[PDB]
Amino acid sequence: PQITLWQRPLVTIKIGGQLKEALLDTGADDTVLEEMSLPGRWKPKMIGGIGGFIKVRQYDQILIEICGHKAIGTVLVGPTPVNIIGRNLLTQIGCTLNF
Amino acid sequence: PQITLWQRPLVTIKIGGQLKEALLDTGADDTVLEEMSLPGRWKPKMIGGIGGFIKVRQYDQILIEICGHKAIGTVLVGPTPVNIIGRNLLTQIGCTLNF
Numbered sequence: 001p002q003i004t005l006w007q008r009p010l011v012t013i014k015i016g017g018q019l020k021e022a023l024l025d026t027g028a029d030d031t032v033l034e035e036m037s038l039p040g041r042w043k044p045k046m047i048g049g050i051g052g053f054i055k056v057r058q059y060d061q062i063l064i065e066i067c068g069h070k071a072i073g074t075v076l077v078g079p080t081p082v083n084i085i086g087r088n089l090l091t092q093i094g095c096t097l098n099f
Numbered sequence: 100p101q102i103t104l105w106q107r108p109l110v111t112i113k114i115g116g117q118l119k120e121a122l123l124d125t126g127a128d129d130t131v132l133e134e135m136s137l138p139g140r141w142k143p144k145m146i147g148g149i150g151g152f153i154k155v156r157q158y159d160q161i162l163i164e165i166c167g168h169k170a171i172g173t174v175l176v177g178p179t180p181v182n183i184i185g186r187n188l189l190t191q192i193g194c195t196l197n198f
């Protein structure tokens with residue numbers, strides 16, 4: 001699909017059998033979701049944004065469906081203000097910026 | 100042009116006769132640039148992202164060139180680690196997300 005930017009590019013994603021809303025963010029290197037439970041062990045990671053850094057839990061090889069597109073990659077979990085789909089997953093679904 | 104997301108989507112912008120590098124960020128509501136001098140009156144504003152909030156100076160009706168495309172809009176200036184071109188200006192150049 002083609003998404004304009006007059007409003008936030010929010011889409012529905014499916015993870016752990018649940019539907020959630022997430023932001024398609026080309027300015028995010030990684031994908032970070034709000035506190036939730038995921039399977040397996042996690043590794044520590046620090047990510048920095050415009051206001052500073054936050055500690056997040058990194059889970060690998062996680063299945064996530066974005067607008068019907070299945071992706072499997074690294075997902076970070078932590079105190080993010082909203083669910084963010086970053087470049088690591090955007091590339092998997094073949095998302096590009098056009099103008 | 101078409102921009103893939105294997106790397107950060109950085110482009111050259113022209114503002115105040117100065118050339119700079121900035122991130123095309125669909126996850127950013129506004130446009131924020133590192134500390135610089137701009138003409139006119141400004142208003143204080145607080146913007147939040149990953150890490151928390153930062154205080155910036157808001158300037159309206161600023162002209163900016165993004166990849167040869169002219170755009171007019173509100174520009175925020177503050178302690179951002181990277182120059183960010185947000186949705187308020189991406190819409191003006193006809194930028195869309197496609198997959």
Ligand SMILES: O=C(N[C@H]1c2ccccc2C[C@H]1O)[C@H](CCc1ccccc1)[C@@H](O)[C@H](O)[C@@H](CCc1ccccc1)C(=O)N[C@H]1c2ccccc2C[C@H]1O
Binds near residue numbers: 125
């Ligand atoms: O921090 C970022 N990337 C980092 C990131 C994010 C997730 C995972 C990893 C990493 C690493 C970085 O790339 C970039 C900036 C570039 C940047 C790159 C590198 C270093 C520092 C900054 C950014 O797109 C953020 O992902 C979004 C998150 C979405 C959000 C929406 C609404 C309220 C709060 C948050 C954000 O903070 N948005 C807000 C914003 C930004 C600028 C001006 C105004 C406003 C208002 C908000 O909309």
